[PDB]
Design an enzyme around this catalytic site. Structure first.
Site, short mmCIF file in Angstrom:
data_model
loop_
_atom_site.label_atom_id
_atom_site.label_comp_id
_atom_site.label_asym_id
_atom_site.label_seq_id
_atom_site.Cartn_x
_atom_site.Cartn_y
_atom_site.Cartn_z
N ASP A 1 1.55 6.68 10.78
CA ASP A 1 2.68 6.13 9.98
C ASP A 1 3.98 6.82 10.41
O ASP A 1 5.02 6.17 10.54
CB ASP A 1 2.52 6.44 8.49
CG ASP A 1 1.37 5.68 7.82
OD1 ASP A 1 0.86 4.68 8.37
OD2 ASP A 1 1.02 6.09 6.69
N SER B 1 -21.71 5.58 -0.13
CA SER B 1 -21.99 4.95 1.16
C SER B 1 -20.69 4.75 1.95
O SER B 1 -20.40 3.67 2.42
CB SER B 1 -22.76 3.61 0.96
OG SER B 1 -22.11 2.73 0.03
N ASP C 1 -1.43 8.35 -3.43
CA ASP C 1 -2.64 8.89 -2.80
C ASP C 1 -3.16 10.07 -3.62
O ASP C 1 -2.40 10.95 -4.04
CB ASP C 1 -2.36 9.42 -1.39
CG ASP C 1 -1.90 8.36 -0.40
OD1 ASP C 1 -2.33 7.20 -0.50
OD2 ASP C 1 -1.12 8.73 0.51
C1 HO4 Z 1 -7.14 1.44 2.80
C2 HO4 Z 1 -6.13 1.60 2.82
C3 HO4 Z 1 -4.81 1.92 2.80
C4 HO4 Z 1 -4.43 3.14 3.13
N1 HO4 Z 1 -3.09 3.15 3.07
C5 HO4 Z 1 -2.17 4.23 3.32
O1 HO4 Z 1 -2.53 4.89 4.46
C6 HO4 Z 1 -1.65 6.02 4.37
C7 HO4 Z 1 -1.94 7.06 5.41
O2 HO4 Z 1 -1.37 6.49 6.59
C8 HO4 Z 1 -1.97 6.58 3.01
O3 HO4 Z 1 -0.82 7.26 2.51
C9 HO4 Z 1 -2.32 5.31 2.25
O4 HO4 Z 1 -1.44 5.07 1.13
C10 HO4 Z 1 -2.67 1.93 2.74
N2 HO4 Z 1 -1.40 1.52 2.59
C11 HO4 Z 1 -1.18 0.22 2.22
N3 HO4 Z 1 -2.26 -0.64 2.01
C12 HO4 Z 1 -3.50 -0.18 2.18
N4 HO4 Z 1 -4.48 -1.05 1.95
C13 HO4 Z 1 -3.73 1.12 2.56
MG MG Z 2 -2.76 4.04 10.83
#
Ligand code: HO4
Ligand code: MG
Ligand code: HO4
Ligand code: HO4
Ligand code: MG
Ligand code: MG
Ligand code: MG
Lengths: 339, 326
Positions: free
Chosen positions: A294, A33, A19
Site C-alpha cells: 500500500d 482453517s 485493523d
Molecule cells: C481482506 C482484506 C482487506 C485487507 N485490507 C487492507 O489491507 C491493508 C494492508 O495493506 C490493511 O490495512 C487492511 O485494511 C483491505 N482493504 C480494503 N478492502 C479489503 N477487503 C481489505
Molecule cells: Mg497488497
C-alpha cells in the site's frame, strides 16, 4: 510545460477499515482453517473469530483499508499542500467511525465519508505468526457505499473533477463497481490517469466480472506476485513468469488510447516488475508486506501527480515502503527524505 | 427476432472468379491455396484476369456473405441482420447494394468516390483457390464518417449479436473495438472470425486487442494452426488449440467463450468452458468452395444464436447452410 501539485490533485475511494491485529498461534489459524499469509473476506463461519480475537489476545487498533493507506502515504510524500489527496468511503456512526475520521484529518487527507447507522464501521483482523499476516476483512459499513448516496452528490463529485490521478484498490470492486466505473469513465473521457490494484487473489478469482469490466480503463495496474499469478492462472495466460504476466496484462484492450497502460507488480523482497508499451524491466528493492505494498503505491502516486518519470515513481514507491514498513500503522512522525 | 437483432460490419467486395492456369499463378507468385491482400506487385492481375480468362461476378466479402446467409435462415423479419461497410459509387457498388436488398439485409454503406468498390480475385486451378483482395473502397471505412454518426450507431445498439470477420481488423480496428466494447458493456454477444492466416501473422496486435471481447471465435483448421503457432501454443492438435484459445483473457465474464473450428469434411470442433467436442459433417457431396462454405457455416450458426437456441442446434444450422451454399 511542467506540472506541479495543488489541493484535491489525487482522488481515492475504497473500504475504510479499522485493523485489529494480534500475534496468534498456529492453532488459532487452524481453529478457523485460515492460512498464514492470506487475505480473505469474512464469511459467516468467521463471525466468532472477531470476538475471540479481542477477547483472548492482546490486540492493537490501527486505521486501515488498502486505498485509504495508499492515499495517506501519498499525502505524506507530497507534503504540500495539505489535502492534495481526497478519500471517499463508507463507515458506521460509532467509535471506530470517529477514529477513522480523526486519523484521516491527522494525515491531512480530504476525507469525505458516507455515514450510516445500520452497519458498524468495517474492521479487518490481522492474525500474525512469525512474519506472516492472515487478514480477514469484515467490510460491514464499507460494503454500504453507493454512488447515488455519495459520489453522485455534486459537492463530492466536484472534488473527483479536481483530480488529475485516481486510485482505487481492486478491493472496492466487491462493494461498488458502479462507483469505480463512473470514476473510470470520467478519467477516460477527460484524459485523467485512472489507476487500480489487483489487491488480493480473491479479486481475480471471484470478482473478475467487475475487474475485467474496469480493466479497459486502467492506466496503471498495481499488484504483487501472487495476485499476478492468480490473475494469469484465471485469465488463461499459460505462464508463471512474472515478466510475461506483466507484458500480457499490459497489452489488454484499452479505451483511452492517448495513454499506454503501465503494469507494476511488487514482489516482497524480489524485484519490482514494470511493463510498459515497449519493454518489461526489474527494479531491486532496498514485517507488514501488505502495508508495504500500500505504501509503495502511495509513494508511486506521490510522484505521478507531478508527472515525474516512471523510474522516479518506482524509486519513491520503494522509498515509502521501506519507511512505513518499520513503523506499524499510518502515522508519520518524520518527513520524507527522498531526492 | 426483431429488425436489426444481428449486426455485422466488414469489407464489401465483389468477387471476380475464374479458372486460371499455372502460368498466371507463377506470373504473380501466388500460392495455389491462399488468401492475401493485394500489394503493388498485384496491380496488373485484376485487369489480366478479366481480359484473359472467363470470369464470373458474385457479391462477396466474408462478413457480408455470413450476414446474408444469416438473414436467409432467420427468414423473418426482413432486415433481422444489419451490415455496415464502405463501397465506391460505381457499377460494382450498385450490384452490392442490390444484392443486399434482395437478400433482405439492412445494409447501410458508407459510399465515397476517391476509391472504387473493393474486389477479390478468386484464381482457381483444379480444387485450389487462390484469393487476392483489392480492398480499395472497403479500406476507407472510418468510424467517424459512419459508425459514429448517431443514426448508424443506433442500429448497432439494437443488436443482440454482433459478428465481424477478423478481415476487418486490417481496415478499422477502431470500429471493431468500439462494437466489441459496446457488446461487452451491455452483455451482448460479440463474435469474430480468424478469417485467414495473414490476420494472425501480421495483425496480431489488433487481433489480441479484440480477442478478450470475443464471445464466439470461428475459424478453420489452418487459421487455428497459424494462430497457435503465432501465439506460441506449442501444441498443434486442433482440439487442444480450441481449448487454450477458449481459456484466453475475457472481459465479459457473464459469458464463457465458445471456439468453433471447422475442418472441411472433417468434424467441426467446439470448445466450451468444460469440454471440447467434435461434430461430424453427415451430409457429404463429392467434388468445393471451402471459403464460401465457411462463411455460410457462420451465417447458419448466427441464425439460431439470435434466437438463443442450443449450441448443438446452432452447429447443425451451420452445417445445413454450408451444404446448401455448396
Ligand atoms: C481482506 C482484506 C482487506 C485487507 N485490507 C487492507 O489491507 C491493508 C494492508 O495493506 C490493511 O490495512 C487492511 O485494511 C483491505 N482493504 C480494503 N478492502 C479489503 N477487503 C481489505
Ligand atoms: Mg497488497
Ligand atoms: C483475401 C480475402 C478476402 C476474401 N474475402 C471473402 O471471402 C469470401 C469467401 O468466403 C469471398 O466472398 C471473399 O470476397 C474477404 N472478405 C473481406 N476481407 C477480405 N480481406 C477478404
Ligand atoms: C469440403 C468441404 C465441405 C465443407 N462442408 C461444410 O462446409 C463447412 C465449411 O468448411 C464444413 O464445416 C461443412 O459443414 C461440407 N459439407 C458437406 N460435404 C463437404 N465436402 C463439405
Ligand atoms: Mg480499499
Ligand atoms: Mg469482412
Ligand atoms: Mg473462412
Amino acid at each position: 510545460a511542467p506540472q506541479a501539485l495543488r489541493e484535491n490533485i489525487l482522488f481515492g475511494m475504497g473500504n475504510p477499515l479499522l485493523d485489529i491485529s494480534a500475534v496468534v498461534d498456529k492453532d488459532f489459524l487452524d481453529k478457523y482453517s485460515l492460512k498464514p499469509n492470506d487475505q480473505i473476506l469474512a464469511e459467516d463461519k468467521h463471525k466468532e473469530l472477531f470476538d475471540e480475537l479481542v477477547k483472548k489476545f492482546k490486540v492493537e487498533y490501527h486505521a486501515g483499508g488498502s486505498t485509504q493507506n495508499s492515499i495517506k502515504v501519498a499525502q505524506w510524500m507530497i507534503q504540500q499542500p495539505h489535502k492534495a489527496a481526497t478519500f471517499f468511503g463508507c463507515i458506521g456512526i460509532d467509535k471506530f467511525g470517529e477514529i477513522l475520521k480523526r486519523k484521516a484529518a491527522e494525515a491531512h487527507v480530504d476525507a469525505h465519508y458516507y455515514e450510516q447507522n445500520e452497519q458498524p464501521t468495517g474492521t479487518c483482523a490481522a492474525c500474525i505468526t512469525g512474519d506472516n499476516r492472515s487478514l480477514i476483512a469484515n467490510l460491514a459499513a464499507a460494503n454500504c457505499y453507493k454512488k447515488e448516496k455519495h459520489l453522485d452528490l455534486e459537492k463530492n463529485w466536484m472534488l473527483v473533477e479536481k483530480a488529475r490521478v485516481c486510485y482505487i484498490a481492486g478491493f472496492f470492486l466487491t462493494v461498488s463497481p458502479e462507483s469505480v466505473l463512473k470514476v473510470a469513465h470520467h478519467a477516460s473521457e477527460n484524459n485523467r490517469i485512472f489507476t487500480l490494484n489487483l489487491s488480493a487473489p480473491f479479486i481475480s478469482q471471484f470478482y473478475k466480472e467487475s475487474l475485467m469490466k474496469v480493466m479497459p480503463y486502467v492506466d496503471i495496474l498495481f499488484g504483487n506476485e501472487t495476485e499476478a499469478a492468480t490473475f494469469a492462472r484465471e485469465q488463461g495466460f499459460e505462464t508463471k513468469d512474472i515478466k510475461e504476466i506483466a507484458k500480457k496484462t499490459q497489452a489488454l484492450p484499452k479505451m483511452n488510447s492517448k495513454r499506454q497502460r503501465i503494469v507494476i507488480f511488487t514482489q516482497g523482497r524480489d524485484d519490482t516488475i514494470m511493463a510498459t508499451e515497449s519493454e518489461v524491466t526489474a527494479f531491486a528493492v532496498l514485517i507488514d508486506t501488505n502495508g508495504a505494498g500500500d505504501a509503495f503505491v502511495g509513494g508511486f502516486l506521490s510522484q505521478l501527480v507531478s508527472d515525474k518519470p516512471l523510474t522516479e515513481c518506482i524509486r519513491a514507491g520503494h522509498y515509502a515502503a521501506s519507511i512505513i514498513i518499520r513503523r506499524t500503522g499510518c502515522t508519520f512522525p518524520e518527513k520524507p527524505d527522498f531526492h
